[PDB]
Amino acid sequence: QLTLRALERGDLRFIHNLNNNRNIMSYWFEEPYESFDELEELYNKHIHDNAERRFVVEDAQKNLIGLVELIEINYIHRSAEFQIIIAPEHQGKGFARTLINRALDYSFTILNLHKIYLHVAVENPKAVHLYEECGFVEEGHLVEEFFINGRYQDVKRMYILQSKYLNRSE
Amino acid sequence: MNSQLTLRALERGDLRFIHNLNNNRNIMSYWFEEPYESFDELEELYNKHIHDNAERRFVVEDAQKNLIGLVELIEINYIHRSAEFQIIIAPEHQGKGFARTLINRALDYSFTILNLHKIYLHVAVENPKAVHLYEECGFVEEGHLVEEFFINGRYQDVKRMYILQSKYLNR
Amino acid sequence: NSQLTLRALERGDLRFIHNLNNNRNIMSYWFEEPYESFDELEELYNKHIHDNAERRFVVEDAQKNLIGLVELIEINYIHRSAEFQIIIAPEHQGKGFARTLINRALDYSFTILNLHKIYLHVAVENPKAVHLYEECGFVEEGHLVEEFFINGRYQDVKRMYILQSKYLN
Amino acid sequence: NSQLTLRALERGDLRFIHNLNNNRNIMSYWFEEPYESFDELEELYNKHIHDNAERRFVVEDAQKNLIGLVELIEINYIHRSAEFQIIIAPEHQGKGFARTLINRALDYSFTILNLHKIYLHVAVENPKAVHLYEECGFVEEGHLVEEFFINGRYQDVKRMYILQSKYLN
Amino acid sequence: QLTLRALERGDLRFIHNLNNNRNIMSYWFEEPYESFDELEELYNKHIHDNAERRFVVEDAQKNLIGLVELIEINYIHRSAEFQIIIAPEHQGKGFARTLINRALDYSFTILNLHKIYLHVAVENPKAVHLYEECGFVEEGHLVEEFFINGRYQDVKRMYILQSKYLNRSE
Amino acid sequence: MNSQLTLRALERGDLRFIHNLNNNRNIMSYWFEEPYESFDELEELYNKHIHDNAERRFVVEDAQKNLIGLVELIEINYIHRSAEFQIIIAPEHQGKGFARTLINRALDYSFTILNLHKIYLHVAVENPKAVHLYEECGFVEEGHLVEEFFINGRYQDVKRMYILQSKYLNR
Amino acid sequence: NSQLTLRALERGDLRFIHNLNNNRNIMSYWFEEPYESFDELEELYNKHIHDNAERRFVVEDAQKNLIGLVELIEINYIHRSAEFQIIIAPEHQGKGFARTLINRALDYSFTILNLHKIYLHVAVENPKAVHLYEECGFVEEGHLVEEFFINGRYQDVKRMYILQSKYLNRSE
Amino acid sequence: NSQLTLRALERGDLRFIHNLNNNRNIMSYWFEEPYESFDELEELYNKHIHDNAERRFVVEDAQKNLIGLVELIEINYIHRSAEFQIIIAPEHQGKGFARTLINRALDYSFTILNLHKIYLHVAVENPKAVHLYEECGFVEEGHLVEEFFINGRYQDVKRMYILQSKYLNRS
Amino acid sequence: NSQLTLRALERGDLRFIHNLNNNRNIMSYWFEEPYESFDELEELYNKHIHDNAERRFVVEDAQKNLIGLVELIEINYIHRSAEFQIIIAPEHQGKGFARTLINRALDYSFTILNLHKIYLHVAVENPKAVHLYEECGFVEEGHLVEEFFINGRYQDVKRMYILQSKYLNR
Amino acid sequence: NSQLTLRALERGDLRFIHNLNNNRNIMSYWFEEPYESFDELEELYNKHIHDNAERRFVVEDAQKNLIGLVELIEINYIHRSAEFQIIIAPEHQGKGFARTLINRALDYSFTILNLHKIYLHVAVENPKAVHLYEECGFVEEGHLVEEFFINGRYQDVKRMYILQSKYLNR
Amino acid sequence: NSQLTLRALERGDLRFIHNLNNNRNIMSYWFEEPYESFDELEELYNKHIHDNAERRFVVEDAQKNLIGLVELIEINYIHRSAEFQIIIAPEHQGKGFARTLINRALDYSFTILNLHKIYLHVAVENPKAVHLYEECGFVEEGHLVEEFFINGRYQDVKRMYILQSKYLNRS
Amino acid sequence: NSQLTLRALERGDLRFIHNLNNNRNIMSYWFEEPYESFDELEELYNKHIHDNAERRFVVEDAQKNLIGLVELIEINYIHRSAEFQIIIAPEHQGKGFARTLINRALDYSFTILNLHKIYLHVAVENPKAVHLYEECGFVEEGHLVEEFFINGRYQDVKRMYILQSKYLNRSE
Structure with missing residues (x-):
């Protein structure tokens, strides 16, 4: 049912809306x-560049569902950081797992990465429990990492490995 | 009402409106x-500095999408954690009591998101109502700048007024 | 006369400028x-969009008819002086618009731009123009001998000036 | 089969190429x-428009339906050899078009381009493809061990080749 | 009735047609x-450049009449070469004198040049007699100057001076 | 008839037609x-060399403006006053007897306008009718170039044939 | 002091500038x-050789010892103002030079540049400097609160200013 | 030992940096x-000379011998954070400079650059070093699993941090 | 005095120009x-090397000591005029070189460059130079009020002029 | 033999590379x-300095005489393979250095660069080197027919390979 | 006297050319x-190093003394024409080199560059020189009236030419 | 002759090239x-360092005397052909070198370049050269009429050629 498509210029206004709330x-x-114009200029500048890969998610109706990002990709350590943003009008439809799995399948099969980590705000138990559900495990609790909404906030760093993802059924 | 108003990062399309404001x-x-x-000079300037982060500007519109004004931070120093705020309301929205709401919004962004330590601003000595306004919002005079700006035919004095992040967050 | 407005010049106004510089x-x-x-002028316009040495303002009226041009050149920010010229369209010349125009320019050059002296050149063989600028408050400071080749003949211009303090008081 | 034509690839064909490289x-x-x-691909396409290292040809039919792609890469003008690959659209796969396609490529690479050897890689775990290329006249020359990571598993490809003299005679 | 307008990009297709026959x-x-494309590329390259000035001629109906060119303009010697091309559909209407006079008036008043010369093919008595009519005088008969239509052809060089043009009535 | 045909310097718009010809x-x-x-490679090439004068090309159309063919001079040397001529007629106009008219037109341009001394051309040994054609137009063999060009699967021989300006003008 | 001279800064001078902005x-x-x-600075110098927003002058004595630097920054020719500052090389402080320099800076700014107003900032924790500029005709227009993070804490600075007519016509 | 000093990196220091990143x-x-x-580095140095995400200091002594490097990287001026690394030359390890240098980088970070958090990475497989940093005020916030491929295999590293509020109210 | 030469300026001479424009x-x-x-001036020098608006000539003696600068600016090739300025080194004033200098400049502008008018500004409050130029055939044509800010007060310059024919019919 | 070092290549080394690739x-x-x-190679060197496809290491002894070249090309960071070639100076062959060399390369590609496969071409008609590589753990995976034109005839190369684990479980 | 030679101009020759264009x-x-x-020239030389409309040769002797310059300008490769100029240094005038040099430039023009007409300009006010060129084969084709503003006034120049057909069938 | 070697041309070599193309x-x-x-050439060299349409080789002897130049131009890798020519420095002609050079040029072209055909032009007014190339396996395919203007008149030149299989396999 759901599909992932590499991001392109048409998609920027959708990106931009996501990066508000x-x-x-x-x-x-x-x-x-x-x-927008800032983003558009950044888009055009880093079109060649491979440190980051983005995928829009649409359904069988082409509704724009959410975005899967991979950044900080390093091909020596063979690792990347992942994040995901679903548009408010599409949360609570059970989509997030399917997507995380598609991100992992891409990273670990096509890109052949060794490790994907991510960050979740500690003051967000639900997401933590979700990534946990999907294979991720805590490797860090990073104290006062980010200043959000008026104060420095803690975040969990969570990770999964390739052999784990691909071979944990064998 | 005043929850009804919204800030929005500026865009090429907003330049006509800016130009109209900076005429009055x-x-x-x-x-x-x-x-x-x-306008052409501005568009040329806009594009040159589209990536520069010493200034950030927000367009203020309402629920019916009318263009209300501009919230502007310039001279952003990310070592000393300071910036200068300016605000401009279109003529036909002056005197409808939005200023204090917009001031508060800018203070919010500067302090809860941009994580600055100090916002300062300039007001004309020759306009005490504006000075008594900012004071009411928490600003305090730190200077009377003598003959600082050449404005409409002569040199004018301005108050430099500031407010610190610790005082806002604890308001 | 009160209807007349001044507007920074923009790209769209280049046609109007070109027609004015025809005759x-x-x-x-x-x-x-x-x-x-035009093509020559446009390319020039793009090149000097940020050059402060000159500044131009289009005059338009009630229903936005293009009346004329006000122009400052050789602007110098050390000595605080500019040369000034003005052109009104043929189809609006001789209505009483010149004075108002001159003024608005001075107003700009002295209240906004913070200049000390404004000078201009008028053809000697243009009697009444010289008397006009006198009425607005200019004074001859030079009778410039054989300065410009015009209609196939070197001609004399007067150079005329007025000061910030004399406008404002 | 005789309806099929080959056409140098052009900018307009980039959509078709992109859809093919999806799965x-x-x-x-x-x-x-x-x-x-697409945007990545387009920018690339502009950059290598004159690079001779690779050459691409779109296959279309009677009423110009896009059938598939023929592709030569690592073309070397000293040793006279290219790697070759071919992709047929899902909605035209399994019609008898492959052979014709292979041929037309060889024809190009040997009658026009004046190449000596054509090689290609087929997944080992693709039995019938290997038998296919044999039928057109390719011979294994290498069984390449754990060459490509595919579906999360390093896999074996055979490398297969055919020569100018063997096509032409 | 007749007018001269500085040349611009719109006018190129008219130029181009003239430069055939x-x-x-x-x-x-x-x-x-x-x-055309060659010309257009040359036009765009030399838009700044002042060695040459061109003027389209139109009538009170905007029919494109002909072209007045000045080339080799030198502001030390204060001289230039002039030529003129009327479109075949507008020859024999007595226009050429009016135009030559307008070229001379421009060169000698606005540009303030000292001397305008030109070339006419010797195998064209009519034009010679025309420029002669307009003030020009022969300063040279240049032997085999140009290869035209299969052979090297002679041309008269003809000139007029500024004081002559402007003051010969006083 | 054949006065009916006209030459015309090539233009960006003519590139589609050229591309169609060079396919056959x-x-x-x-x-x-x-x-x-x-086509894209060509457009990119066209624009790069739009100013280069080592080659000149004319489109041949008729009175009803149909596209007939291409007259082409390459390798123009302006010291030795020489160039190579090639001609290409669209399929559907081959065998209507235009060639000799077009050849004559190109010779005309090369010799009465461009002032060249020698036009030469290549013809496939394996096509004697074409060779007997050019000879009839005044061309003469100066060489049998052995295995010169790789064409459609093998190396072919070609006649190099020429004609000089003095012989044309005195025809 | 009779000996001292000013010279517009050039490339040779960068090493000196750099040595000043250290300790x-x-x-x-x-x-x-x-x-x-250094390299950082050099790159910036070249990038900004045209730019007229800031003018710098080296001070040398009659023996051509590099005594200090006079800077003008934030120069605006609408408001006709600029911000001044001065740095003397540690091995030349307490030799009475500072005043003479300040007069030269004010003289250039107000004659040759034809500026209207010159301001500067002094750290509030420097009473002696405040007094100095105060002697040279400068007057306080601001006590800028927590203006700068210097040495592990935010610090107050005085803004001080002098006007052109003052400078030129005070003795008239 | 206080004789040790820190100096903003210069093109001429690159050889030394290269000698360091050999081992x-x-x-x-x-x-x-x-x-x-070295040629890659020098070309990288020139590209990034104005970039502010990283900062490097060469450590020398009274006798101007080259001791080591102090780097700050991933500098973020919103979240006010940065990663720190240090390298001592082989022949200067175990002479008791590290804590002093650690302490100098902490000083710059928090007294001049006005940061809020400095973190670093250390090999799980080097407890000596983890205990060294701990003694200097650093605290563990993460055990990064198989983070870096280093000399033959993937290795775990401790991520350790320390906050500005704590370095300044220090013993 | 008869030995004084004039030489087109070039890069080498910039030090001299720089020193001259010093105080x-x-x-x-x-x-x-x-x-x-200097660095500023050098960049400037390279930027305007083919710019014709201005032309500069260094003066040297038969011993090649650097004597002065002759400088024409605001050169207009239509109306054929220029502004002229001259600077003599502090170590060569009071030797009676000026007029020779003034002359050589006139000579160049009127016999080589084909200009019709030369004009120049002289501080009103420097009456000696005023009379100097008068003595060479310059004549007041303007008393320019408050033209230049100099030494903290706007001052008056005379503008003074000579023609190509008055130079040559002498 | 234990002293042989490996050093990243740089501009200085180009002469050596040039001499080596000579005959x-x-x-x-x-x-x-x-x-x-050389000039061609130099331009090439500057053009690809940050290009990761290929990496090169110069070999020197403890006396710093220039011994050989180690060279990895066609490096693919997804599939983690490279082609490997090695050249020893004519004046250092027949000293038993190759295997040490071969090894150090393997060492770098497998323990620093994180690659999974190394492969290499050897002229079939050079059976000694074929066996040499076999002796270090390479294994034929292809007999490439008429791959390369060498000395006026298309010749056959073997392509031979080793894996990251077979290197390290030894 | 045959010792004289001609040499395609080189950057290093520019000083000499400048010394020449002083007088x-x-x-x-x-x-x-x-x-x-000199700085204008050197910058012009580099711009036009590939331009083919002009050609210049330095004339030196056996003892490599700099004698003079031979220039061809306004070269047109369709009409096959060019203007020629010569300059002899002051201290080498009246020693009988001119005719030899005239004849060397004629030789290059017609035997190598394959031109058809060489013309030049000479002052009407220098009959000596007009008679010199006439003796070398040149013939008058024009009396250009007030052509060049030269040292104080407008002057007339003879335009003289000579054709390739005539230099080759020469005595 | 046993001593002679070939070397791809580089920048140092330009002076030599230039001295050759004179007389x-x-x-x-x-x-x-x-x-x-020279300068003209130098500019062209730099402009064309990438370009593979032409390859040049300097000849040196065991003492590193610059003996002559071997050029290949008009190189095409569709038709696999190229045009060759050679220039020996006057002070080295009649030393028997020419053949050895021509073999080396044919060897590079037909082994390392894997070209199919090599042609050249000889002026018809040079019988001796014609004979030479003729000895080296070249054969006439054209008598190009008034091909070049050389020395005040238009001149005929022979086109000559040799094929790759000939060169390599003639002794087989």
Whole structure:
């Protein structure tokens, strides 16, 4: 039913809408941005660049569901950071697992990465329990990592490995 | 009402409106400390500094999407954690009591998101109602700048007023 | 007269400028670079969009008819002085618009731009123009001998000036 | 089968190429530079428009339906050899079009381009494909051990070849 | 009635048509050209450049009448070469004098040049007699100057001076 | 008739037609000694060498404006006053007897306008009718180039044939 | 003091600039861009050779010892103002030079540049400097609160200013 | 021992940095971009000379001998954080400089650059070093599993941090 | 005095120009762009090397000591005029070189460059130079009020002029 | 023999590479671009300095005489393989250095670079080297027919390979 | 006297060319572009190094003394024409080199460059020189009236030419 | 002759190239662009360092005397052909070198380049050269009429050629 498509220029206005509400400073290849035109200029500059890969998610009706990002990709350590944003009008439909699995399948089969980690705000038990459900395990509890909404907040770092993902059924 | 108003990062399309605002005023207008007068100069300036992060600007519109004004932070220093705030309300929305709501919104962004230590601003000595307004919002005078700006025919004095992050967050 | 407004010049106004510089019988310049054709002028316009040495303002009226041009050149921010010229369209010349125009320019050059002296050149063989600028408050400071080749003959211009303090008081 | 034609690839064909490289489950390249998105591919396409290292040909039929792609890469003008691959659209696979396609490529690579050897890789775990290329006249020359990571598992490809003299005689 | 307008990009297709029939190799700032696109590229390159000035001629109906060119303009010697091309559908209407006079008036008043010369093919008595009519005088008969239509052809060089043009009535 | 045909310097718009011609042929096609296959390659080549004068090309159309063929001079040397001529007629106009008219037109341009001394051309040994054609137009063999060009599967011989300016003008 | 002279800064002078901006421990800036290494600075110098927002002058004595630096930054020719500052090389402080320099800076700014107003900032924790500029005609227009993070804490600084007519016409 | 000093890196220091990143048997990075040869580094140094995400100091002594390098990387001026690394030359290890240098980098980070958190990475397989950092005020916040491929295999590293509020209210 | 030469300026001479413009006590420009440092002036020199608006000539004796600068600016090739300025080294004033200098400049502008008018500004409050120029055939044509800010007060310059024919019919 | 070092290549070393590729008797490339002259190779060197496809290591003894070249090409970071080649100077062959060399390369590619497969071509008609590589753990996986034109005839190369685990479980 | 030789101009020859264009009291041109200072010329030389409309040879002797310059300009490869100029250094005038040099430039023009017409300009006010050229084969084709502004006034020049057909069938 | 070696041309070598293209009095060319001055050539060299349409080799002897030049131009890898020519420095002609060089050029072209056909032009007014190339396996395929303007008149030249299988397999 659900599909993942590599991101392209048409998709930017959708990206841009996503990067509002949850109200961090957003980034594109580590360069920060607030406005469409800013983003568009960043998009055009880093079109060649492989440190980050993005995939829009649409359904069988082409409703734009959410975004799967991979950043900080390193091909020596063979690792990457993953995050995911679902559009508010599509949360609570059970989609997030399917997507995480598709991110992991891509990273661990096509990109051939060794390790995917991610970050979840400690003041968000639900997500933690979700990534836990999907294979992730805590490797860190990072104290005062980010200033969000008025204060420095803690976040869990969580990770999964390739042989685990691919071979844990054998 | 005033929850009804919303901030929104500026966009190429917003330049006409900016230009209209900076006309009424009869000072020179700067964009990243660089002067301009015509829309073309501005568009050329906008594009040059589209990536620069010493200034950030928000368009203020309402629920019916009318264009209300501009919230502007310039001179952002990310070592000393400071910036200068300016606000501009369109003529036909002056005197409807939005200022204090917009001031509060800008303070919010500067302190809860951008994580700055100090916002300061300039007001004309010759406009005490505006000075008594900011004071009411928590601003305090730190300077009377003598003959600082050449405005509409002569040099004018301005109050430099500030507010610190610790005082806002604890309001 | 009160209807007249001033507006920073923009790209769209280049047609109007070009039509105005048609009859002059002299080589019109742009940031001291000569030009005949729109295309020449446009390319120039893009090149000097940020050059502060010159500043231009279009005059339009009630229902936005293009009346004329106000122009400052050789602007110098050390000595605080500019040369000034003004052109009104043929189809609006002789209505009483010149004065108002002159004024609005001075107002700009003295209340906004913070200049000390404004000078201009008028053809000697233009009697009434010289008397006009006198009425607005200019004074001859030079009678410039054989300064400009015009209609196939070197001619005399007067150079005329007015000061910030004399406008404002 | 006789209806099928070959056509140098052009910009307009980039959509067709992109759709074809969707399912592959591997990272498609362009002049050895990887790409996922149309926009990525387009920018690449502009960059290597004159690079001779690779050459591409779109297959279309009677009423210009896009059938598939023929592709030569690592073309070497000293040793006179290219690697070769072919992709047919899902909605035209299994019609008897492969053979014809293979041939037309060889014809090109040997009658026009003046190459000596054509090689290609087929997944070992693809029995019938290997038998196919044998029928057109390819011979294994290598069984390449754990060459490509595919579906999360390093896999074996056979490398298969055919020569100019063997096509032409 | 007749008017001269500085040349611009819209006018190129008209230029291009003119530079066919009379069948020399045509030039733009001394660079040669045969095709529209060639010309257009030359036009865009030498838009700044002042060695040459061109003026389309239109009537009170905006019919494109002909072209007045000035080339080899030198502001030390204060001289230029002039030529003129009328479109075949507008020859024999007595226009050529009016135009030559307008070229001379421009060159000698606005540009303030000292001397305008030109070339006419010796095997064209009519034009010679025309320029003669307009003030020009022969300063040279240049032997085998140009290869035209199969052979090297002679041309008269003819000139007029500024004080002559402007003051010969006083 | 054949006065009815006209030459015309090539233009960006003519590239589609050129591309269509150079398909039939199953040689590689060059544009300023640089190979191409797809329309995009050609457009990119065209624009690069739009100013180069080592080659000149004319489109041949008729009175009803149908596209007839291409007259092409390459390798123009302006010291030795020489060039190579090639001609290409669209399929559906081959065998209507235009060639000799077009050949004569190209010779005309080369010799009465471009002022060249020698036009030479290549013809396939394996096509004697074409060879007996050029001879009839005044061309003469100066060489049998052994295995010169790789064409449609093997190396072929070609006649190099020429004609000089003095012989044309005195025809 | 009779000996002292000013010279517009040039490339040779960069090593000296750099030696000055070390053991004072603000972050330093060229045209509002930060820098710590020589190379960093050099790159910035070249990038900003045209730029008229800031003018710098080296001070040398009659023996051509490099005495100190006079900077003007934030120069605006609409408001006709600028911000001044001065740095003397540690091995030359307490030799009475500072006043003479300040007069020269005010003289250039107000004659040759034809500026209207010159301001500067003094750390509040420097009473002696405050007094100095105060002697030279400068007056307090601001006590800027927690303006700068210097040495592990935020610090107050005085803004001080002098006007052109004051400077030129005070004795008239 | 106080004789030790820190000096903003200069092009001329690159050889020394290269000599340092020989031993390591990791891949070396300059601004998140990998290098091996001095020529790669020098070309990287020039590209990134203005970039502010990283900061490097060469440590020398009274006798101007080259002791070591102090790096800050991944500097973020919103979240006010940065990763720190130190390298001592082989022949200067075990002479008691590390704590002093650790303490100098902490000083710069918190007194001049006005950061809030400094963190670093240390091999799980080097408890000596983990206990060293702990004694200097660092606390463990993570056990990164198989984070870095280093000399033959994937290794775990402790991530340790320390906060500005704590370095300043220090013993 | 008869030995004084004039030589086109070049890069080598910049040090000299720089030293000369040192204590001018008003800002020096170069093609209307202001400068203070040698480095600034050098960049400027390279930028305007083919710019014709201005032309500069170094003066040397038969021993090749650097005597002065002759400088024409605001050169207009339509109206054939220029502004002229001259600077003599502090170590060569009061030797009666000026008029020879003034002359050689006139000579070049009127016999080589084909200009019609030369004009120049002289501080009103420097009456000696005023009379000097009068003595060479310059004549007041303007008393320019408050033209230049100099030494903290706007001052008056005379503008003074001579024609090509008055130079040559003498 | 234990003293042999390996050092990343740099500009200084190009002379050596150039000399080594001299009488190869087939064309030498650089990032897949062919070259003959030092000057050509230098330009090439600057063009691909940050290109990761290929990596090169110079071999020296404890006395720093230039011993050989170790070279990895066609490096793919997804599939984790490279082609390997090695050249020893004519004046250092027949000293038993190859295997030490071969090893150090393997060592780098498998323990630093994180690669999974190394492969290499050896002329069939050079059976000694064939067995040499066999002796270090390489194994035929292809007999490539008429791959390369060498000395006026297309010749056969074996392609031979080893894995990361067979190197390390030894 | 045959000892004299001609040598395609080199950057290093520029000083000498500059020394030559001092005396002249005309404005000097390099590729139809005027110059005065050596710095203008050197910058012009580099711009036009590939341009083929002009050609220059330095004349030296057996003892490698610099004698003179031979220039061909306005070269047209369709009409096969060019203007020629010569300059002899002051201290080498009236020693009988001119005719030899005239004859060497004629030789190059017609035997190597394959031109058809060489013309030149000479002052009407220098009959000595007009008679010199006439003796070398040149014939008058024009009396250009007030053509060049030279040292104070406008001057007439003879335009003289000579054809290739005539230099080759020469005595 | 046993001593002779070939080396791909580099920048140092340009002076030598230039000295060669003087007193032979064709117009000379680099990548089909004309040139007379050293500087001209140098500029062309740099412009065409990538270009593979032409390859040049310097000949040196065991003492490193610069003996001559071997050029290949018009190289095409579809038709696999190229045009060869050779120039020996006047002070080295009649030393028997020419053949050995021609073999080396044919060897590079037909082994390392894997070309199919090598042609050259000889002026018809040079019987001796014709004979030489003829000895080396070249055969006439054209008598190109008035091909080149050389020395004040248009001149005939022979086109000659040899094929790869000939070169390699003739003794087989």
